[PDB]
């Protein structure tokens, strides 16, 4: 898709329908939001997006097989759970990488909505990733400058996109969250502090839910209420589409957005803002070595279709 | 196989071919500058029997 | 770069208004028609350097 296709007559609004809606399911750690999101997608026919992980970009490109952490992400969630105040900057590096992954996820979702026309259900989003960073700063895990840089990156990236039509919040109390985490069994999850979960909940209810409520409907559900998928789907169906800026958009603006989301590098252009924070800054020698390792990886040396090492042929005529 | 040998050591003929071609190019320029074959006031001589040119 | 496409294609697009001795509507003469005609006829193809 390009300017020519828009000139030829390809209009996104023609494909878009009432079903076409961006629904984000948000909540605290281990709130069971993923199950509800899947149920919503199945009962609305929408495309569910699993929550963006460290190797989400690895799935989108190449063979989908997650690449080495040193080559893709250079951050560990498990390390953050074990040591939230490490001197390696793993906390903020992880948070920034997650934001970049979620920015890519939101763009990947929008592109699906503007090409196929099918709605999308996403587990959290960029508009919700700030909660974890705020929690980390409250706990003292990260420094203030990290928060400042994250705000800088967000303000220059998120603005280009459109907020979700429906914001579903699964409200699970912190004690129940602790109980589930203990039942979950993950030792790193067990190491999660209760204060961190409380900060996440506070950030949600005091910043995210009101601001999203201004933009669109916020269908807050209890854990018991979320179990009733039928009710959740019905409530979303009965939400006025007026909520959200999508009714205020047209084929021209949709064309701009579609061109934006297609170019993933353009989407992630400002994720690498040249602010030198020790947590994110990577030395030149290490950068060169890691990039050389990345290029050595099969399928990454040349552009897709020209990597003969993976089986591509006819390159002499390609 | 000799094929494998030339397959990996073909680049070993570039510069020798370069020298051969350069000798040819130098010879070509000399041919273009044959305007005083036996017109110098120092080496002017009659062509010997069965001599096309002095190549000078 | 005066790409004289007018002369190449033999099309008059602005040469009609270049001088006042050119044909004006209803053959209305210019105030200095004679003088301009004399000057142009004198300086036709002799070059700007010589015409000066």
């Amino acid at each position: 898709y390009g300017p020519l296709a828009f000139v030829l007559g390809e209009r996104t609004t023609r494909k878009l329908t009432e079903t076409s809606k961006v629904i984000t399911v948000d909540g605290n750690i281990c709130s069971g939001k993923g199950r509800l999101a899947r149920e919503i997608a199945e009962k609305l026919g929408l495309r569910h997006f699993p929550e963006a992980g460290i190797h989400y970009a690895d799935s989108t490109t190449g063979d989908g097989k997650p690449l080495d952490v040193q080559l893709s992400g250079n951050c560990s969630l498990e390390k953050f759970y074990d040591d939230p105040k490490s001197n390696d900057g793993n906390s903020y590096r992880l948070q920034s990488w997650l934001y970049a992954s979620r920015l890519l996820q939101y763009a990947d979702a929008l592109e699906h909505l503007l090409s196929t026309g099918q709605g999308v259900v996403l587990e959290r989003s960029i508009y919700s990733d700030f909660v974890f960073l705020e929690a980390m700063y409250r706990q003292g895990f990260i420094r203030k400058q990290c928060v400042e840089h994250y705000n800088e990156v967000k303000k220059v990236t998120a603005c280009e996109y459109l907020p979700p039509h429906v914001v579903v919040y699964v409200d699970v109390p912190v004690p129940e969250i602790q109980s589930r985490i203990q039942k979950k069994g993950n030792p790193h999850e067990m190491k999660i502090t209760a204060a961190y979960l409380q900060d996440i909940e506070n950030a949600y209810k005091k910043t995210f839910l009101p601001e999203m409520s201004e933009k669109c409907e916020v269908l807050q559900y209890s854990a018991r209420e979320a179990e009733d998928a039928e009710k959740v789907v019905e409530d979303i169906e009965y939400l006025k589409c007026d909520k959200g800026p999508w009714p205020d958009q047209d084929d021209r603006t949709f064309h701009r957005l579609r061109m934006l989301v297609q170019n993933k590098l353009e989407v992630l252009n400002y994720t690498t803002i040249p602010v030198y924070l020790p947590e994110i800054t990577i030395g030149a020698h290490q950068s060169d070595r890691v990039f050389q390792k990345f290029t050595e990886l099969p399928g990454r040396k040349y552009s897709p279709g020209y990597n003969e090492d993976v089986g591509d042929k006819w390159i002499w005529l390609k | 196989n000799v094929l494998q040998i030339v397959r990996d050591h073909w680049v070993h003929i570039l510069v020798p071919v370069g020298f051969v071609f350069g000798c040819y190019l130098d010879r070509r320029s000399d041919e273009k500058l044959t305007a005083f074959r036996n017109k110098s006031l120092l080496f002017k001589r009659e062509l010997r029997p069965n001599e096309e040119v002095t190549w000078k | 770069p005066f790409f004289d496409v007018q002369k190449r294609l033999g099309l008059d697009l602005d040469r009609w208004m270049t001088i006042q001795s050119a044909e004006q509507p209803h053959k209305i003469p210019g105030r200095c028609h004679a003088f301009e005609k004399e000057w142009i006829e004198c300086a036709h193809g002799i070059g700007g350097i010589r015409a000066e």
């Binding site: - | 110098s40 080496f43 | 053959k27 036709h44 070059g47």
Partner: protein, 63 residues
């Protein structure tokens, strides 16, 4: 090769280069003369074309 070959080649090269120098100086002089007189094909700045002038009977007899 023989020394006479290089001798003749040097003579030819000298002739070519000297003729080039003569032509370059000649060109500079010709260009200066043409640009100072406008009597040559070069530096012929355009003038008004006499074809544009209309000699058809005007309105006022004294043109």
């Amino acid at each position: 090769d023989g020394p006479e070959k290089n001798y003749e080649k040097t003579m030819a090269i000298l002739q070519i280069e000297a003729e080039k120098a003569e032509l370059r100086l000649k060109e500079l002089e010709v260009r200066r003369l043409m640009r100072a007189r406008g009597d040559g094909p070069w530096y012929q700045y355009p003038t008004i074309d006499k074809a544009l002038i209309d000699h058809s009977p005007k309105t006022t007899p004294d043109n």
